[PDB]
Amino acid sequence: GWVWNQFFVVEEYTGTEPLYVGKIHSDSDEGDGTIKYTISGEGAGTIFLIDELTGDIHATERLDREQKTFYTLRAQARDRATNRLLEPESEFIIKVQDINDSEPRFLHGPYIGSVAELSPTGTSVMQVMASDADDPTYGSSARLVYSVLDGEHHFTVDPKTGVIRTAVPDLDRESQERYEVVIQATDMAGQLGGLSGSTTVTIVVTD
Amino acid sequence: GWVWNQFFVVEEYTGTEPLYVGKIHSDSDEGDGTIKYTISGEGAGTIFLIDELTGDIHATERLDREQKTFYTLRAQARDRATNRLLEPESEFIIKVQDINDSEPRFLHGPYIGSVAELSPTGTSVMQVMASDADDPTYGSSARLVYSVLDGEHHFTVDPKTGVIRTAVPDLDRESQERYEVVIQATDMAGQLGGLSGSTTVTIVVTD
Ligand SMILES: [Ca+2]
Ligand SMILES: [Ca+2]
Ligand SMILES: [Ca+2]
Ligand SMILES: [Ca+2]
Ligand SMILES: [Ca+2]
Ligand SMILES: [Ca+2]
């Protein structure tokens, strides 16, 4: 069947006034105040507070999807005069939504490789893989694009794979044996506003 | 029973990235892509757009609660190869939540009242009622507070009922027969950041 028992909440909420999660409600509620809505479970009475009359739920402190992706709660509908149930206690999930708040990070450094001297232009040297803690299944918050600096005219980098390639063929080891190239990974598919990380890759020329 | 088939969307959203409304989903979804989620009804395919792969719904334009408070839609789950649905098309509502973006306005103004000369201090003259197009059932966005301007020491106004009253007992008609008093209604229960409107009330001293 269709899945409806859910609420969505943005993570890392910036406002002062509590964030509105939603509203649990019973189709028996005629709108007179005889029903008492109460919640329980993860974050109940701490993170999420409910208005026992209206059913409105609010988040009182910010949420982090990289820490916890969903909260499982239960909802009860009491009679305000007798505190007895008018609806079965029902599980409902609060899904916290991803935002691009995780920068790309090169976690496997120091990155060092080697390539033979006088190699052809386009020779695969090594590969670097940055990581992004955001949600890859929703939006480009974790879709990365690798690049070099504009003032780097010895090597290039594939944009989406991050494999380093030589940009010049006349690399004689005697003139200069060691190069330090910086690589940049940017999320949001490289569009402006995308977060970025960087690493220093040392590449050394062999015979 | 519990009402769950709903999504909540804040009105007057100004940002660039489309707003996330929610996600329709079938527990029959094995997560392989053989499912085609589609939307119909109010705002379907124009205001609200859906991702057929995941089911995520987005709002493509700013919403206005004072224009429309909720949108009634239908959700379908088709098979990607046969276009025969595996769940009955289910109605679901997108309720747009209120923000304090409507100023108080005196719509039955500007009218006129009377008070007998030499009346005691605190004599009820008349009542003024401002209106607020925001949601009165949620927040103080429509809870108003009436007030006078600084340096108005002839009449007062109750902050909650808005009934004007004499502030002085020495109202001699011969000395001054007519007063133009300004009344101001402010929402958010008067707290800073509350919107305001005003009207000019002519009060006249009688015998
Ligand atoms: Ca986070
Ligand atoms: Ca990111
Ligand atoms: Ca994130
Ligand atoms: Ca509006
Ligand atoms: Ca208002
Ligand atoms: Ca409003």
Side-chain angles (χ1 to χ4, degrees):
Chain A
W2 294 103
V3 177
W4 299 113
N5 58 334
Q6 56 192 5
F7 298 117
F8 298 86
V9 180
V10 186
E11 65 167 323
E12 320 295 341
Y13 166 74
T14 67
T16 12
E17 290 298 302
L19 184 61
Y20 185 72
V21 179
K23 172 144 154 170
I24 63 167
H25 191 257
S26 177
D27 50 28
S28 304
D29 183 5
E30 293 180 351
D32 54 342
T34 62
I35 299 168
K36 181 177 169 186
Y37 297 97
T38 67
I39 65 176
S40 69
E42 305 186 295
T46 62
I47 302 169
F48 307 111
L49 301 181
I50 181 165
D51 183 324
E52 66 181 15
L53 291 180
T54 59
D56 297 326
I57 300 174
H58 291 87
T60 62
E61 63 181 321
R62 297 166 179 165
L63 298 172
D64 181 20
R65 195 198 66 79
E66 287 68 41
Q67 278 176 347
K68 189 162 185 180
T69 62
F70 67 90
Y71 294 78
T72 311
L73 298 89
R74 294 191 156 260
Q76 302 80 225
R78 309 278 177 172
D79 180 86
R80 185 176 179 83
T82 55
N83 257 25
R84 67 185 43 170
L85 300 169
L86 305 175
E87 300 285 17
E89 183 173 337
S90 289
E91 175 176 306
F92 73 95
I93 301 170
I94 295 173
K95 309 238 170 67
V96 4
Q97 180 180 181
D98 177 67
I99 69 174
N100 184 23
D101 67 321
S102 305
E103 77 289 27
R105 297 173 65 180
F106 291 101
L107 233 149
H108 308 335
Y111 290 90
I112 304 158
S114 46
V115 61
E117 67 175 5
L118 306 170
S119 287
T121 284
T123 302
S124 296
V125 179
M126 70 188 111
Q127 187 184 33
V128 302
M129 281 288 290
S131 53
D132 198 304
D134 293 327
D135 192 335
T137 72
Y138 173 70
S140 299
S141 301
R143 293 181 188 176
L144 306 177
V145 176
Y146 305 83
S147 59
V148 253
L149 279 290
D150 290 324
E152 228 303 311
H153 295 101
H154 289 198
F155 314 79
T156 49
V157 62
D158 293 5
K160 299 182 292 182
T161 59
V163 319
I164 298 165
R165 294 186 178 283
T166 60
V168 263
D170 59 5
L171 296 185
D172 58 336
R173 186 178 68 95
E174 192 180 353
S175 64
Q176 186 172 2
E177 180 172 350
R178 189 173 304 277
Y179 298 103
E180 287 184 353
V181 180
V182 179
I183 305 302
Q184 175 182 283
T186 72
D187 61 26
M188 296 298 300
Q191 302 173 112
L192 283 178
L195 309 175
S196 304
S198 282
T199 182
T200 60
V201 185
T202 316
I203 175 57
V204 75
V205 183
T206 60
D207 281 318
Chain B
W2 293 102
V3 177
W4 299 114
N5 58 334
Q6 56 192 4
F7 299 118
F8 299 97
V9 181
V10 187
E11 66 165 324
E12 317 294 341
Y13 170 77
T14 65
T16 39
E17 291 298 302
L19 249 184
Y20 184 72
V21 179
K23 172 188 245 91
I24 63 167
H25 191 258
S26 177
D27 50 28
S28 177
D29 180 7
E30 294 180 351
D32 53 342
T34 61
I35 304 163
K36 185 173 69 176
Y37 297 97
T38 66
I39 300 299
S40 69
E42 305 186 295
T46 62
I47 301 171
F48 309 111
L49 300 181
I50 180 165
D51 183 324
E52 295 187 355
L53 290 178
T54 57
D56 297 326
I57 299 174
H58 290 86
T60 63
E61 64 181 46
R62 189 176 78 263
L63 298 173
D64 182 20
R65 196 198 67 79
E66 287 68 41
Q67 182 215 8
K68 189 162 186 179
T69 63
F70 68 93
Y71 297 78
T72 311
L73 298 89
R74 303 191 164 261
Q76 303 81 19
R78 307 280 176 173
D79 180 86
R80 180 59 55 87
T82 55
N83 197 80
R84 73 139 217 240
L85 29 70
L86 359 174
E87 301 284 17
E89 85 171 5
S90 171
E91 176 177 306
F92 74 94
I93 302 170
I94 295 173
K95 300 124 167 163
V96 355
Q97 188 56 244
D98 177 67
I99 70 174
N100 184 24
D101 66 321
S102 305
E103 289 199 4
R105 299 177 66 180
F106 290 100
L107 317 187
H108 311 336
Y111 41 109
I112 303 157
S114 47
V115 61
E117 67 176 5
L118 304 170
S119 286
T121 285
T123 302
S124 296
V125 179
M126 73 187 112
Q127 185 186 32
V128 302
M129 284 290 291
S131 53
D132 197 304
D134 293 327
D135 193 335
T137 72
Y138 174 70
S140 299
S141 301
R143 292 180 188 175
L144 307 177
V145 176
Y146 305 84
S147 59
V148 253
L149 279 290
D150 291 324
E152 169 65 39
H153 302 330
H154 295 102
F155 307 77
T156 51
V157 61
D158 293 5
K160 57 274 185 307
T161 58
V163 335
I164 298 165
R165 277 165 178 151
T166 60
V168 298
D170 59 5
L171 293 185
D172 183 25
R173 177 179 173 179
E174 191 181 353
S175 181
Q176 186 171 3
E177 179 173 350
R178 189 171 303 277
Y179 296 83
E180 288 184 353
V181 181
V182 178
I183 304 301
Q184 176 181 74
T186 71
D187 59 26
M188 297 298 300
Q191 302 175 113
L192 284 180
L195 309 175
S196 304
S198 48
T199 183
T200 291
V201 183
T202 316
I203 297 175
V204 72
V205 183
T206 61
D207 282 318

